Design a protein around this ligand. Structure first.
Ligand code: HEM
Ligand SMILES: O=N[O-]
Length: 184
């Protein structure tokens, strides 16, 4: 289960974050042991469509090849803090698993600037018992974490040395599909 009430960035700029562009996960920290594979890759696009906040997600396991996409409409809890019902889709936006109650994640943007972000997410999926996940994001694939986001990790009282890097995994990203999915 999740245990953290993540605090959103003071002065979070939603229009800049939800601009339709892609964010790559470069480093992550799951608070629950063995909750996720130690080698993994993920990216998301965040944008608006008809005034609705949307995210499209991409997960890729570089070992098993398990690959999936999701689309979510985000509902606002407060500035920088959202609740998202996800539907699993193929890369084209075709629905594979419909939205259902109890299938949702929370999403909190703890820090963001032009090129980087620190987020917290808590995933709820059926009767699975999942824990908190922090992720360092960058606009550039596999970019080393800069001083601003690393300082934000510290300011959140987290130890960046504990984060697991995705940068060394052989991962490819379909950034074009992520951007197109925002409308789906
Ligand atoms: C490298 C970072 C991440 C890792 C290692 C990771 C790991 C995983 C794993 C292992 C699953 C499968 C869970 C299951 O089916 O039992 C999963 C599903 C999921 N994750 Fe992540 N994740 C990451 C980043 C993210 C982010 C940033 C978000 C939200 C912004 C997210 C949202 C979701 C959602 C919505 C599902 C379920 C999708 C579906 O079943 O259709 N993940 N993740
Ligand atoms: O571990 N996916 O939120």
């Amino acid at each position: 289960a999740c245990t953290k009430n993540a605090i959103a960035q003071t002065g979070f700029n939603k229009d800049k974050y939800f601009n339709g562009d892609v964010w790559y996960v470069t480093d992550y920290l799951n608070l629950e042991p063995d909750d996720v594979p130690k080698r993994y890759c993920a990216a998301l696009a965040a944008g608006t469509a008809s005034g609705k906040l949307k995210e499209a997600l991409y997960h890729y396991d570089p070992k098993t090849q398990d690959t999936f996409y999701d689309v979510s409409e985000l509902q606002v809890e407060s500035l920088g803090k959202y609740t998202a019902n996800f539907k699993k889709v193929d890369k084209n936006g075709n629905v594979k698993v419909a939205v259902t109650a109890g299938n949702y994640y929370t999403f909190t943007v703890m820090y963001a600037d032009d090129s980087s972000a620190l987020i917290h997410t808590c995933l709820h999926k059926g009767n699975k018992d999942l824990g908190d996940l922090y992720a360092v994001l960058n606009r550039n694939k596999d970019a080393a974490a800069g001083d601003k986001v690393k300082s934000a990790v510290s300011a959140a009282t987290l130890e960046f040395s504990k984060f697991i890097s995705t940068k060394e995994n052989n991962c490819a990203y379909d950034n074009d599909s992520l951007k197109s999915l925002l409308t789906k």
